[PDB]
Amino acid sequence: KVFGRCELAAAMKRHGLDNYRGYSLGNWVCAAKFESNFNTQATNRNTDGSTDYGILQINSRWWCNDGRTPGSRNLCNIPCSALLSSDITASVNCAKKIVSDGNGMNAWVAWRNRCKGTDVQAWIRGCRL
Ligand code: NA
């Protein structure tokens, strides 16, 4: 499923992400924009055998199990296929676990490079939240 920007903003707010661990809602929408272009089916297969899954491109080396990544952990304790759903709930719950560590949203390189330090509120501007 390909969310609209404002549709995803509303859904992330309803899933409790506004100011979660200090990151305002627009951070999360911006991260989804540059990780997956709001596509819950997005995948990115890396040549180390790991894969990034879903709207927030959550990687199978650390966070989810896909059974195809050697030496991997499953720290969100979920199958990676749960990250491909039209319901963003599993991606959001794993995202909350990832962002609660020392590096915060720096775990998302796209967020680090295209969002951090910018006026991220622009990503929720005009959305009737
Ligand atoms: Na894994």
PDB file of C-alpha atoms and ligand atoms in Angstrom:
ATOM      1  CA  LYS A   1       0.000   0.000   0.000  1.00  0.00           C
ATOM      2  CA  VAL A   2       1.227   3.513  -0.857  1.00  0.00           C
ATOM      3  CA  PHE A   3       0.123   5.979   1.814  1.00  0.00           C
ATOM      4  CA  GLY A   4      -0.621   9.582   1.176  1.00  0.00           C
ATOM      5  CA  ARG A   5       1.614  11.890   3.177  1.00  0.00           C
ATOM      6  CA  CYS A   6      -1.212  13.255   5.305  1.00  0.00           C
ATOM      7  CA  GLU A   7      -2.871   9.847   5.619  1.00  0.00           C
ATOM      8  CA  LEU A   8       0.386   8.414   7.026  1.00  0.00           C
ATOM      9  CA  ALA A   9       0.810  11.409   9.361  1.00  0.00           C
ATOM     10  CA  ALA A  10      -2.616  10.698  10.860  1.00  0.00           C
ATOM     11  CA  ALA A  11      -1.859   6.974  11.189  1.00  0.00           C
ATOM     12  CA  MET A  12       1.524   7.553  12.857  1.00  0.00           C
ATOM     13  CA  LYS A  13      -0.111  10.015  15.256  1.00  0.00           C
ATOM     14  CA  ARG A  14      -2.800   7.455  16.079  1.00  0.00           C
ATOM     15  CA  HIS A  15       0.015   4.974  16.744  1.00  0.00           C
ATOM     16  CA  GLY A  16       1.578   7.288  19.320  1.00  0.00           C
ATOM     17  CA  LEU A  17       4.672   8.458  17.453  1.00  0.00           C
ATOM     18  CA  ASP A  18       4.284  12.233  17.983  1.00  0.00           C
ATOM     19  CA  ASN A  19       7.232  13.329  20.178  1.00  0.00           C
ATOM     20  CA  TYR A  20       8.048   9.664  20.837  1.00  0.00           C
ATOM     21  CA  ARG A  21      11.481   9.710  22.515  1.00  0.00           C
ATOM     22  CA  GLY A  22      11.729  13.389  21.552  1.00  0.00           C
ATOM     23  CA  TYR A  23      11.041  13.043  17.820  1.00  0.00           C
ATOM     24  CA  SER A  24       8.093  15.102  16.568  1.00  0.00           C
ATOM     25  CA  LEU A  25       5.592  13.621  14.119  1.00  0.00           C
ATOM     26  CA  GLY A  26       7.199  15.221  11.071  1.00  0.00           C
ATOM     27  CA  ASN A  27      10.451  13.375  11.705  1.00  0.00           C
ATOM     28  CA  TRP A  28       8.620  10.072  11.339  1.00  0.00           C
ATOM     29  CA  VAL A  29       6.789  11.130   8.178  1.00  0.00           C
ATOM     30  CA  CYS A  30      10.019  12.450   6.649  1.00  0.00           C
ATOM     31  CA  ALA A  31      11.804   9.200   7.521  1.00  0.00           C
ATOM     32  CA  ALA A  32       9.086   7.147   5.822  1.00  0.00           C
ATOM     33  CA  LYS A  33       9.237   9.468   2.803  1.00  0.00           C
ATOM     34  CA  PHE A  34      12.918   8.964   2.160  1.00  0.00           C
ATOM     35  CA  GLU A  35      13.124   5.329   3.333  1.00  0.00           C
ATOM     36  CA  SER A  36      10.246   3.962   1.275  1.00  0.00           C
ATOM     37  CA  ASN A  37       8.364   6.849  -0.435  1.00  0.00           C
ATOM     38  CA  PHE A  38       5.410   5.851   1.805  1.00  0.00           C
ATOM     39  CA  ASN A  39       5.212   2.304   0.316  1.00  0.00           C
ATOM     40  CA  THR A  40       4.488  -0.413   2.902  1.00  0.00           C
ATOM     41  CA  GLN A  41       5.641  -3.063   0.387  1.00  0.00           C
ATOM     42  CA  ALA A  42       9.062  -1.472  -0.168  1.00  0.00           C
ATOM     43  CA  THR A  43      12.000  -3.882  -0.027  1.00  0.00           C
ATOM     44  CA  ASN A  44      15.734  -3.309  -0.476  1.00  0.00           C
ATOM     45  CA  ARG A  45      17.873  -6.445  -0.828  1.00  0.00           C
ATOM     46  CA  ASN A  46      21.527  -5.877   0.089  1.00  0.00           C
ATOM     47  CA  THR A  47      24.481  -7.861  -1.191  1.00  0.00           C
ATOM     48  CA  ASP A  48      25.464  -8.902   2.350  1.00  0.00           C
ATOM     49  CA  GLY A  49      22.368 -11.125   2.335  1.00  0.00           C
ATOM     50  CA  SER A  50      20.277  -8.795   4.524  1.00  0.00           C
ATOM     51  CA  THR A  51      17.054  -7.076   3.398  1.00  0.00           C
ATOM     52  CA  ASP A  52      15.240  -3.851   4.396  1.00  0.00           C
ATOM     53  CA  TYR A  53      11.478  -4.247   4.837  1.00  0.00           C
ATOM     54  CA  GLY A  54       8.567  -1.878   4.642  1.00  0.00           C
ATOM     55  CA  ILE A  55       7.599   1.740   5.103  1.00  0.00           C
ATOM     56  CA  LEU A  56      10.567   2.340   7.429  1.00  0.00           C
ATOM     57  CA  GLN A  57      12.977  -0.088   5.711  1.00  0.00           C
ATOM     58  CA  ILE A  58      13.724  -2.075   8.834  1.00  0.00           C
ATOM     59  CA  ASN A  59      16.703  -4.351   8.348  1.00  0.00           C
ATOM     60  CA  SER A  60      16.887  -8.121   8.873  1.00  0.00           C
ATOM     61  CA  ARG A  61      20.479  -8.076  10.195  1.00  0.00           C
ATOM     62  CA  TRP A  62      19.331  -6.776  13.594  1.00  0.00           C
ATOM     63  CA  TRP A  63      15.584  -6.306  13.892  1.00  0.00           C
ATOM     64  CA  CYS A  64      13.429  -8.961  12.192  1.00  0.00           C
ATOM     65  CA  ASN A  65      13.780 -12.590  11.158  1.00  0.00           C
ATOM     66  CA  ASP A  66      13.595 -13.549   7.516  1.00  0.00           C
ATOM     67  CA  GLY A  67      15.645 -16.766   7.814  1.00  0.00           C
ATOM     68  CA  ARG A  68      17.888 -15.668   4.922  1.00  0.00           C
ATOM     69  CA  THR A  69      20.403 -13.434   6.768  1.00  0.00           C
ATOM     70  CA  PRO A  70      23.386 -15.182   8.390  1.00  0.00           C
ATOM     71  CA  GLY A  71      24.568 -14.133  11.824  1.00  0.00           C
ATOM     72  CA  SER A  72      21.417 -12.093  12.306  1.00  0.00           C
ATOM     73  CA  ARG A  73      19.415 -11.041  15.336  1.00  0.00           C
ATOM     74  CA  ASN A  74      15.678 -10.582  15.656  1.00  0.00           C
ATOM     75  CA  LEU A  75      15.576  -7.857  18.285  1.00  0.00           C
ATOM     76  CA  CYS A  76      12.011  -6.771  17.477  1.00  0.00           C
ATOM     77  CA  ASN A  77      11.006 -10.462  17.698  1.00  0.00           C
ATOM     78  CA  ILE A  78       8.949 -10.474  14.496  1.00  0.00           C
ATOM     79  CA  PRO A  79       9.014 -12.075  11.038  1.00  0.00           C
ATOM     80  CA  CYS A  80      10.158  -9.549   8.500  1.00  0.00           C
ATOM     81  CA  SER A  81       6.955 -10.305   6.561  1.00  0.00           C
ATOM     82  CA  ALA A  82       4.996  -8.567   9.338  1.00  0.00           C
ATOM     83  CA  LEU A  83       6.751  -5.377   8.180  1.00  0.00           C
ATOM     84  CA  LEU A  84       5.169  -5.644   4.696  1.00  0.00           C
ATOM     85  CA  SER A  85       1.562  -5.276   5.901  1.00  0.00           C
ATOM     86  CA  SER A  86      -0.891  -2.561   4.970  1.00  0.00           C
ATOM     87  CA  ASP A  87      -1.336  -2.068   8.699  1.00  0.00           C
ATOM     88  CA  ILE A  88       1.682  -0.104   9.904  1.00  0.00           C
ATOM     89  CA  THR A  89       1.337  -1.462  13.440  1.00  0.00           C
ATOM     90  CA  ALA A  90       4.247  -3.912  13.334  1.00  0.00           C
ATOM     91  CA  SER A  91       6.606  -1.410  11.702  1.00  0.00           C
ATOM     92  CA  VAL A  92       5.654   1.199  14.309  1.00  0.00           C
ATOM     93  CA  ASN A  93       6.192  -1.142  17.247  1.00  0.00           C
ATOM     94  CA  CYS A  94       9.586  -2.193  15.922  1.00  0.00           C
ATOM     95  CA  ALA A  95      10.418   1.473  15.207  1.00  0.00           C
ATOM     96  CA  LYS A  96       9.651   2.386  18.828  1.00  0.00           C
ATOM     97  CA  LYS A  97      12.082  -0.295  19.981  1.00  0.00           C
ATOM     98  CA  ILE A  98      14.800   0.830  17.549  1.00  0.00           C
ATOM     99  CA  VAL A  99      14.469   4.518  18.469  1.00  0.00           C
ATOM    100  CA  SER A 100      14.642   3.827  22.222  1.00  0.00           C
ATOM    101  CA  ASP A 101      18.388   2.986  21.999  1.00  0.00           C
ATOM    102  CA  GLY A 102      21.433   5.256  22.121  1.00  0.00           C
ATOM    103  CA  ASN A 103      21.394   6.380  18.511  1.00  0.00           C
ATOM    104  CA  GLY A 104      17.700   7.286  18.267  1.00  0.00           C
ATOM    105  CA  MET A 105      16.481   7.935  14.739  1.00  0.00           C
ATOM    106  CA  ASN A 106      20.100   8.038  13.524  1.00  0.00           C
ATOM    107  CA  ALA A 107      19.505   4.325  12.877  1.00  0.00           C
ATOM    108  CA  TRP A 108      17.705   5.457   9.699  1.00  0.00           C
ATOM    109  CA  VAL A 109      20.414   6.744   7.334  1.00  0.00           C
ATOM    110  CA  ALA A 110      17.843   8.380   5.047  1.00  0.00           C
ATOM    111  CA  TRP A 111      16.471  10.256   8.069  1.00  0.00           C
ATOM    112  CA  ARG A 112      20.008  11.264   9.090  1.00  0.00           C
ATOM    113  CA  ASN A 113      20.798  12.559   5.594  1.00  0.00           C
ATOM    114  CA  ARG A 114      17.522  14.081   4.322  1.00  0.00           C
ATOM    115  CA  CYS A 115      15.528  14.995   7.466  1.00  0.00           C
ATOM    116  CA  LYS A 116      17.623  15.619  10.569  1.00  0.00           C
ATOM    117  CA  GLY A 117      18.170  19.298  11.306  1.00  0.00           C
ATOM    118  CA  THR A 118      15.528  20.450   8.789  1.00  0.00           C
ATOM    119  CA  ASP A 119      12.113  21.986   9.409  1.00  0.00           C
ATOM    120  CA  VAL A 120      10.435  18.603   9.525  1.00  0.00           C
ATOM    121  CA  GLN A 121       7.080  20.099  10.564  1.00  0.00           C
ATOM    122  CA  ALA A 122       6.652  20.932   6.879  1.00  0.00           C
ATOM    123  CA  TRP A 123       5.939  17.227   6.338  1.00  0.00           C
ATOM    124  CA  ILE A 124       2.676  17.431   8.327  1.00  0.00           C
ATOM    125  CA  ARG A 125       1.719  20.917   7.180  1.00  0.00           C
ATOM    126  CA  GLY A 126      -1.823  21.179   5.787  1.00  0.00           C
ATOM    127  CA  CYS A 127      -3.004  17.725   6.866  1.00  0.00           C
ATOM    128  CA  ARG A 128      -5.971  18.396   9.196  1.00  0.00           C
ATOM    129  CA  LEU A 129      -4.655  16.220  12.002  1.00  0.00           C
TER     130      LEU A 129
HETATM  131 NA    NA B   1      17.235 -11.174  11.637  1.00  0.00          NA
END
